[PDB]
Amino acid sequence: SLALSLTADQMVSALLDAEPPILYSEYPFSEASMMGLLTNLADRELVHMINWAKRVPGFVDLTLHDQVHLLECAWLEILMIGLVWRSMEHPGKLLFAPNLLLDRNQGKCVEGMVEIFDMLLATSSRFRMMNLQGEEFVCLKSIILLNSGVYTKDHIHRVLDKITDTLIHLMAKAGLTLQQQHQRLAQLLLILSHIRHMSNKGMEHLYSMKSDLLLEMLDAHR
């Protein structure tokens, strides 16, 4: 695995270069129309996520079966932290696309998404109050890809240690003290527990709300 030999700055630049683009949605809403826009957007984002996963250092070194399992477990988590990251500079709103900026009242169009909408907004304000940097976001997103299905293995945890060395190396350049480094590291990783919670609650409605790829990704959680 050439990922373990990479330095911290080489890890950051490899993650920044592998970032998928910000897609647009199809140019008021109802229950079936908003779900149609979100489904169509998420279905097209899956194709970029799969190619983004191949460019995550160490992911190719896994077997094809292990790659499928990690993507099947974390695909909604990765979509959410990306949505939360895009919505950072828009307090009180979720930026699904540059032309699809929704607020709380739009979440009431479908019965049961207001609860997930508020948690996504709280996560965005949490990143916003932390002044989360792009180099930190791409590290957290790759951690989700490797960690979310690791217990359902020595190489993955070795790569996870590399991203931790990458995260600490990023905080040291920002001028944080030793105490501030492990505190911010702990703060960022505890948010992943809430991202997992949002994905579990969101997935729960998604395979009750029921694209063949998006169905195979959805059936993997049943």
Binding site: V47, I50, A53, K54, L64, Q67, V68, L71, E72, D212, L213, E216, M217
Partner: peptide, 9 residues
Amino acid sequence: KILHRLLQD
């Protein structure tokens, strides 16, 4: 699985 196909292309 479609995920198998997209992970090899």
